[PDB]
Amino acid sequence: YDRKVPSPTGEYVKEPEWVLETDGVNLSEVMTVPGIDPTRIYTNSFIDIMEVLGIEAGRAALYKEVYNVIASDGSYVNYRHMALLVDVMTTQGGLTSVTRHGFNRSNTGALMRCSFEETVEILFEAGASAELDDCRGVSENVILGQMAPIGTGAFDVMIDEESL
């Protein structure tokens, strides 16, 4: 691989380096092998990076992976959108999937979208658990006949008594 490095004079120059790509992964152990650079080892398995290098490291790999999948077709997406997704997937100190993990919701409310032919069963559990609906979703606010606290509804408008 050609590597962009600062030349002794300051300007970046390409310096070739031998790199090893492997079929199979055992990060914890290969990393320990002498003669390599443990500081720069990597793997497309973000899961192993997480269990071995920590959540934060995991987040960065999870990002690099998503990024490549898109940069693969020469496409571009502002960093903030993939960064957002990667953060959601990492907030709880673990790697939570986005593809309908929970058999119930993702981050919705009981009174929200009448998912499943039986919303009643979801209501029973809510009752037996003292579930508290914040009422920030659209559907839940629809049933309540109100606009959701989103964008244009993220604030209230009141008459002013100062203007002479």
């Binding site: 914890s28 152990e29 990393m31 320990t32 443990p38 500081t39 720069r40 080892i41 990597y42 990076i49 269990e51 071995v52 290098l53 920590g54 959540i55 934060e56 490291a57 960065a60 790999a61 960093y79 903030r80 960064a83 953060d87 990492t90 907030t91 709880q92 100190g93 673990g94």
Partner: protein, 107 residues
């Protein structure tokens, strides 16, 4: 801090939590042959004092449950001997702004 070689007897393992408030930590040599915190992908983690911690929650006006989390047995938390309820300021480089500082509370 107890650094062992291959492993410990499950019997002996249940001998750690037994001398409060003093805490005992275990490390397998293999897991120390390399300092993970010296890795590109691993940003700077800084244990915050209960003071800073209070200051942190006060300004962003947050409940402890609203802060991002980090697992107790997380490699870095294990490194800094983090204890549940403790917060770490994570100083990472950003391609958007210069630096970006995030926070994680040890679960």
């Amino acid at each position: 801090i107890f650094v062992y070689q291959n492993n410990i007897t499950p019997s002996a393992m249940k001998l750690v939590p037994s001398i409060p408030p003093a805490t005992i930590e275990t490390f397998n040599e293999a897991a120390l042959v390399v300092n993970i915190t010296h890795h590109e992908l691993v940003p700077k983690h800084i244990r915050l004092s209960s003071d800073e911690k209070r200051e942190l929650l006060k300004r962003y006006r947050l409940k402890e449950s609203q802060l991002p989390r980090i697992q107790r047995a997380d490699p870095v938390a294990l490194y800094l001997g983090l204890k549940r309820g403790e917060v770490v300021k994570i100083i990472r480089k950003s391609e958007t702004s210069g630096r970006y500082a995030s926070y994680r509370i040890c679960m």
